[PDB]
């Protein structure tokens, strides 16, 4: 058993899981799509940058 | 006669015109001044481009 802490835990528990060898056999999928595309800009009224 | 169609025609008609050899001699003038200067930008509120 790989024991991962849950550092933020409101009560107490343990969740005994499963992870197969595949990334297909999981039980939940985190599927990224686009990752942190940074945007920039500035508003010409005050000329002070936003991001 | 140079017979041009008017492809958007409400009732029907023919307009017999004139165009001289000059482009000074017409009866109406389409005078361009600037042409489709494209403009771009993005509003820093929502960061989504406008054109």
Short mmCIF file of C-alpha atoms in Angstrom, two decimals:
data_model
loop_
_atom_site.label_atom_id
_atom_site.label_comp_id
_atom_site.label_asym_id
_atom_site.label_seq_id
_atom_site.Cartn_x
_atom_site.Cartn_y
_atom_site.Cartn_z
CA UNK A 1 0.00 0.00 0.00
CA UNK A 2 1.35 3.40 -0.94
CA UNK A 3 0.21 5.59 1.95
CA UNK A 4 -0.35 9.17 0.83
CA UNK A 5 -1.03 11.68 3.57
CA UNK A 6 -3.92 14.04 3.13
CA UNK A 7 -2.40 17.10 4.69
CA UNK A 8 -5.71 18.98 4.80
CA UNK A 9 -8.12 16.62 6.54
CA UNK A 10 -11.20 17.92 8.23
CA UNK A 11 -11.81 14.89 10.41
CA UNK A 12 -9.86 11.70 9.90
CA UNK A 13 -10.07 8.70 7.55
CA UNK A 14 -8.22 6.45 5.21
CA UNK A 15 -9.27 5.78 1.64
CA UNK A 16 -7.87 2.49 0.39
CA UNK A 17 -7.74 2.86 -3.35
CA UNK A 18 -6.58 1.11 -6.47
CA UNK A 19 -4.38 2.17 -9.35
CA UNK A 20 -3.71 -0.25 -12.16
CA UNK A 21 -0.58 -0.18 -14.27
CA UNK A 22 -2.37 1.63 -17.09
CA UNK A 23 -3.42 5.23 -17.01
CA UNK A 24 -6.73 3.81 -18.26
CA UNK A 25 -7.36 1.71 -15.14
CA UNK A 26 -7.76 4.26 -12.38
CA UNK A 27 -11.21 4.92 -11.00
CA UNK A 28 -10.97 8.64 -11.68
CA UNK A 29 -9.34 10.54 -14.52
CA UNK A 30 -7.69 13.92 -14.36
CA UNK A 31 -7.67 14.87 -18.00
CA UNK A 32 -5.84 18.11 -18.77
CA UNK A 33 -6.78 20.08 -21.84
CA UNK A 34 -4.96 23.42 -21.91
CA UNK A 35 -2.44 24.24 -19.20
CA UNK A 36 -2.00 27.71 -17.67
CA UNK A 37 -1.83 29.72 -20.84
CA UNK A 38 -0.74 33.08 -19.41
CA UNK A 39 -2.56 36.19 -20.54
CA UNK A 40 -1.32 39.76 -20.24
CA UNK A 41 -2.82 43.18 -20.71
CA UNK A 42 -3.02 46.76 -19.54
CA UNK A 43 -5.90 49.17 -19.28
CA UNK A 44 -5.09 52.42 -21.12
CA UNK A 45 -7.03 54.54 -18.66
CA UNK A 46 -4.44 53.98 -15.91
CA UNK A 47 -1.71 52.19 -17.97
CA UNK A 48 -1.04 49.74 -15.16
CA UNK A 49 -0.51 46.12 -16.12
CA UNK A 50 -2.77 43.19 -15.37
CA UNK A 51 -1.98 39.53 -15.82
CA UNK B 1 -24.46 48.43 -74.21
CA UNK B 2 -22.63 46.83 -71.32
CA UNK B 3 -25.40 44.98 -69.52
CA UNK B 4 -24.66 44.47 -65.84
CA UNK B 5 -26.95 42.43 -63.67
CA UNK B 6 -28.20 43.76 -60.37
CA UNK B 7 -28.30 40.51 -58.49
CA UNK B 8 -30.41 41.96 -55.68
CA UNK B 9 -33.45 43.27 -57.52
CA UNK B 10 -36.63 44.25 -55.76
CA UNK B 11 -39.09 44.49 -58.60
CA UNK B 12 -37.36 44.68 -61.97
CA UNK B 13 -35.86 47.37 -64.15
CA UNK B 14 -33.01 48.43 -66.36
CA UNK B 15 -30.98 51.58 -65.77
CA UNK B 16 -29.42 52.84 -68.98
CA UNK B 17 -26.36 54.72 -67.86
CA UNK B 18 -23.32 56.49 -69.19
CA UNK B 19 -19.61 56.12 -68.60
CA UNK B 20 -17.26 58.23 -70.66
CA UNK B 21 -13.70 57.40 -71.58
CA UNK B 22 -12.48 59.47 -68.63
CA UNK B 23 -13.09 58.53 -65.06
CA UNK B 24 -13.84 62.21 -64.59
CA UNK B 25 -16.91 61.84 -66.83
CA UNK B 26 -19.30 59.52 -65.03
CA UNK B 27 -22.28 60.96 -63.25
CA UNK B 28 -21.15 59.68 -59.86
CA UNK B 29 -17.77 59.17 -58.22
CA UNK B 30 -16.58 56.54 -55.78
CA UNK B 31 -13.50 58.12 -54.30
CA UNK B 32 -11.52 55.94 -51.88
CA UNK B 33 -9.44 57.63 -49.22
CA UNK B 34 -8.15 54.96 -46.83
CA UNK B 35 -8.79 51.26 -47.35
CA UNK B 36 -9.67 48.74 -44.63
CA UNK B 37 -6.92 49.58 -42.21
CA UNK B 38 -7.25 46.57 -39.91
CA UNK B 39 -7.28 47.17 -36.17
CA UNK B 40 -6.61 44.71 -33.35
CA UNK B 41 -6.64 44.72 -29.58
CA UNK B 42 -7.63 42.88 -26.45
CA UNK B 43 -9.54 44.21 -23.47
CA UNK B 44 -7.62 43.56 -20.22
CA UNK B 45 -10.86 43.05 -18.31
CA UNK B 46 -11.64 39.73 -20.03
CA UNK B 47 -8.39 39.28 -22.05
CA UNK B 48 -10.32 38.11 -25.12
CA UNK B 49 -9.26 39.57 -28.44
CA UNK B 50 -11.27 42.06 -30.43
CA UNK B 51 -10.64 43.10 -34.01
#
